[PDB]
């Protein structure tokens, strides 16, 4: 998995690849690794897929209730604190490695979270099996005072480095931009550099090729009147 986060002038951008793997097999070619915690707080997840999904949903749910309780828009530090304390309690057994980002009344923020519940702050971050390939790109090309266009480019380039060089990462690039004083834009399949080529042959079989023993109608409808 390759997930990255990049700060810029007026906000923060996160990105991720779309490969899910079970051993050497690709389970899902177009997996969604960018999760919405609240409207303007999004996080990218690596590690165990059910855990990143579940831990995001739970904190996101509680963040929503908290926002309604306090009559305030949720803060990234709140999501960060709730996530880290949850993960720490389970001592790394919940395999969620998260890059948490967002904008709130305090400003724009970028954090990372590890499964054991340790947090880190940065202008650029990367996690997952392709984090070394991504971090190599970030360390070579990152600078202070990046624009929105430059940050998206840098973020997607870092993901691509993971896609191409890391076997655990592949397929497409998902991006989410969170700018201050604006709606967060979720760019699903921002890049698609891995479309499969046309097959040489069509394997549509002639009807009646398969041997059948019995047929029957299945009753899916309810018990009927009269």
């Amino acid at each position: 998995t390759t997930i990255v986060g990049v700060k810029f002038n007026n906000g923060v951008v996160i990105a991720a690849d779309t490969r899910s793997t079970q051993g050497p097999i690709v389970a899902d070619k177009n997996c969604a690794k960018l999760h919405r915690i609240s409207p303007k707080i999004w996080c990218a997840g690596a590690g165990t897929a059910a855990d990143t999904e579940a831990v995001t949903q739970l904190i996101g749910s509680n963040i929503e209730l908290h926002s309604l309780y306090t009559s305030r828009e949720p803060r990234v530090v709140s999501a960060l604190q709730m996530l880290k304390q949850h993960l720490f309690k389970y001592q790394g057994h919940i395999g969620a490695y998260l890059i948490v980002a967002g904008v709130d009344p305090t400003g724009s923020h970028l954090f990372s979270i590890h499964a054991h519940g340790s947090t880190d702050v940065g202008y650029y971050l990367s996690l997952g099996s392709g984090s070394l390939a991504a971090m190599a790109v970030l360390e070579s090309h990152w600078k202070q005072d990046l624009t929105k266009e430059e940050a998206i480019k840098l973020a997607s380039d870092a993901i691509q480095a993971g896609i191409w060089n890391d076997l655990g990462s592949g397929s497409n690039v998902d991006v989410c931009v969170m700018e201050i004083g604006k709606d967060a834009e979720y760019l699903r399949n921002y890049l698609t550099p891995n479309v499969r080529e046309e097959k040489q042959k069509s394997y549509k079989f002639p009807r009646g090729t398969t041997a059948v023993l019995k047929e029957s109608i299945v009753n899916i409808c309810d018990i009927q009147e009269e």
């Binding site: 099996s129 060089n165 076997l167 655990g168 079989f205 009646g208 398969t210 041997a211």
Partner: protein, 222 residues
């Protein structure tokens, strides 16, 4: 503790035609989650119209191919430049493999060529030298993905003739070299999609009475 074995990934595929044979293999070489090379040739011309590939642990694979090529050379010296027949090559390879029965070449070997009647031949080996002539065989990492497709599309398994409903099987018509190469390319494209150790490039060696020809095709690099 020192582990003398490794896994360099990759996948190979041999198909025997009526008067030709093909031995295909991807060109990707890996360890764990890193790519070593996007183009590292895996299928080799060993002389006497025989092609060979020893997929699995590359160090053992290279050692075996090297030793077989050597065996072909000394077969010529010792037996008046006689051509090593594919069946004789297969038996020779069994003895090379079983020679290291208690410290095996960690590879799935496949050779391809023509038998003494001029028909297409593919021989397949396990790591310790058990072998068997076959019309069709995929080997290596994505062998589990490819073989079922070949049982279906080469040997017409589970396929019957419309109208009869399971009574009459689909006849086992022979496949041309153009038809086989299509199945090879689709096999590797499909394997590349669902197997992380397969990709980068596909190299096919085609063996006919005229000699050994090569064909290369790009594969997805992710």
């Amino acid at each position: 503790q020192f582990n003398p074995y490794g896994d360099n990934g990759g996948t190979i595929l041999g198909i025997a035609g009526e008067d030709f044979a093909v031995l295909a293999g991807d060109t990707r070489n890996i360890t764990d989650y890193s790519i070593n090379s996007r183009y590292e040739p895996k299928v080799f011309d060993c002389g006497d119209n025989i092609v060979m590939s020893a997929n699995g642990f590359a160090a053992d694979g290279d050692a075996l191919v090297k030793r077989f090529k050597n065996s072909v050379k000394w077969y010529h010296f010792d037996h008046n430049d006689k051509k090593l027949s594919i069946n004789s090559a297969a038996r020779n390879i069994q003895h090379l493999l079983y020679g290291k029965r208690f410290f095996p070449y960690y590879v799935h070997t496949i050779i391809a060529g023509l038998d003494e009647d001029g028909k297409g031949a593919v021989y397949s080996f396990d790591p310790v030298g058990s072998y068997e002539r076959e019309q069709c065989r995929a080997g290596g990492a994505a062998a589990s993905l490819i073989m079922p497709f070949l049982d279906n599309q080469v040997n017409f398994k589970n396929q019957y003739e419309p109208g009869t409903n399971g009574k009459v099987k689909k006849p086992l018509k022979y496949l041309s070299v153009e038809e086989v190469i299509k199945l090879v390319r689709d096999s590797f494209t499909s394997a590349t999609e669902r197997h992380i150790q397969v990709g980068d490039g596909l190299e096919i060696l085609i063996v006919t009475k005229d000699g050994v020809r090569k064909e290369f095709y790009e594969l997805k690099r992710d």
